[PDB]
Amino acid sequence: GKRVLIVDDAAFMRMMLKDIITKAGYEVAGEATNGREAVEKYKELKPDIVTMCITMPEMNGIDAIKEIMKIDPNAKIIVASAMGQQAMVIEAIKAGAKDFIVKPFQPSRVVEALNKVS
């Protein structure tokens, strides 16, 4: 399965990540702009992979990860963050995330994460 749900409050970031993901032969199944929409779209779409920004309004990334893991204990979540958020990324990993990618996105690394988690 190669359907990805992209979760990030920044349109810019969703666009750049989508470009990488599609260029790598994956499909973007949907987009969400905060944690609450992430959970709703996960239920709606049942994506193979979720990319999840840590820093987000209305519901942050770690809380959304916890919700999605309850909904689907087999979820595959890659956390996204800027540098300097290592402690938050570790917390997200302990809550169930399988890998991480750092902004600004390095295409080779994102591709590697997608293949690995698949």
Side-chain angles (χ1 to χ4, degrees):
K2 287 191 180 285
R3 289 169 66 257
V4 183
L5 168 63
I6 296 179
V7 189
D8 195 307
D9 67 89
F12 175 89
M13 289 296 172
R14 294 199 307 278
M15 163 176 288
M16 293 301 99
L17 188 55
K18 176 171 187 168
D19 187 55
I20 296 180
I21 287 169
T22 63
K23 269 167 178 168
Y26 284 75
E27 171 185 344
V28 171
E31 282 178 64
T33 70
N34 60 66
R36 174 191 58 93
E37 199 180 18
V39 167
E40 281 324 279
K41 295 236 184 171
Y42 193 89
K43 286 173 171 182
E44 177 204 348
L45 300 172
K46 192 170 178 164
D48 300 288
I49 300 165
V50 181
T51 63
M52 181 76 72
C53 173
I54 300 207
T55 304
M56 286 187 306
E58 208 175 10
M59 189 180 197
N60 66 345
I62 298 166
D63 287 329
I65 287 167
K66 287 166 140 69
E67 287 307 322
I68 286 162
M69 294 306 294
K70 265 294 293 182
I71 292 165
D72 182 6
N74 307 122
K76 297 161 186 295
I77 306 172
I78 300 166
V79 42
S81 68
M83 64 218 54
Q85 300 189 287
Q86 294 92 332
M88 303 199 70
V89 173
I90 295 165
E91 189 172 346
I93 290 175
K94 280 164 179 312
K98 294 214 180 320
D99 204 338
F100 79 100
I101 59 184
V102 60
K103 299 171 189 178
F105 302 120
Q106 315 194 328
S108 88
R109 295 299 163 263
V110 176
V111 169
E112 186 188 349
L114 290 168
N115 295 338
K116 252 269 300 187
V117 82
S118 287

